[PDB]
Amino acid sequence: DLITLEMVFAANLNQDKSSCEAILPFLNEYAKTYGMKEERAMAHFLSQVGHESNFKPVSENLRYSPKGMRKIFGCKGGSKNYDPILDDAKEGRLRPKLWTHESDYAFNPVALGNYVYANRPGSKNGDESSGDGYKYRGRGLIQITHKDAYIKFTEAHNAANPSDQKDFLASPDDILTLRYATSSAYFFWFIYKKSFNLHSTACTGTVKEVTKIVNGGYAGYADRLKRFNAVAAVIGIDGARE
């Protein structure tokens, strides 16, 4: 194989061996069909996937308390503008129904997701009554979210795996299976972020630079680097100081 159990276990910080064993065949199947051949890129991929997911598929949790949903989804400019003391937005309520229609959205993942992800720019989600917001919530290993990602994953997975045609608009929960969570990770890597040259950057770049593309930021940077070096060691590749 291109990916051994020891690489996956190392990317998983030597935890949950059986989760690593369960996902190993899909990891190898889709590295072949999507074209993961380069070893330094693979070490970045395993370390980024391991940090995001620990190789277990995850679905976004949209069950929030009243204050919790206001903090994360209610304020213009995001949570940085939540005033905990006032339970209010510092620079304007972006989603005012989280205040006036509190009981409709708190602890109601379907209603909340349909409201807070409605009409998101670039996302192809329709309005609150379309059901797009909850339906295309985050799923996978590196989570993909919103209608646009599920369109693009459908086309990308079918292009790379023509003998296993799927429709993740019709069946979005399949991304919670190990098989299509793994396919979606490779789609993220090679297709979804192609315009940022994620794969190229992993080939000759830095953990920090890979992290910037994957995360849109530097969240969990130190842990992603720790995982990469552990993978580099098992492979025989130079580690990374950055």
Author numbering: 5 to 246
Q: What is the paper's account of this structure, in its own sentences?
A:
Here, we report that a T6SS effector TseP, from Aeromonas dhakensis, represents a family of effectors with dual amidase-lysozyme activities. Our previous findings have established that TseP serves a structural role because its expression can restore the T6SS secretion in the Δ3eff mutant lacking all three effector genes, and the C-terminal domain, TsePC, possesses lysozyme activities. However, the function of the N-terminal domain, TsePN, which lacks any recognizable conserved motif, has remained elusive. This study unveils that TsePN is capable of cleaving the peptide link between NAM and L-Ala as an amidase. TsePN, the N-terminal domain, functions as a Zn2+-dependent amidase, while the C-terminal domain, TsePC, exhibits lysozyme activities.
While testing TseP-mediated hydrolysis of purified PG from Gram-negative bacteria, we noticed that both TseP and TsePC displayed more efficient digestion than the commonly used hen-egg lysozyme. The crystal structure revealed that TsePC comprises a smaller lobe of seven helices and a larger lobe of ten helices, separated by a concave groove. Additionally, the previously predicted catalytic dyad (E655 and E663) was located near the groove. Although this structural arrangement resembles that of other lysozyme family members, TsePC exhibits a less compact conformation with a notably wider groove compared to the typical lysozyme. Previous studies have shown that the lysozyme possesses catalytic sites at E53 and D70 in the substrate-binding groove, while the active residues in the TsePC structure are E654 and E663, respectively. To test the effect of E663 for TsePC activity, we purified a mutant E663D (TsePC-E663D) protein and perform PG-digestion assays. The results show that TsePC-E663D lost the activity, suggesting the greater distance within the groove requires this glutamate residue.
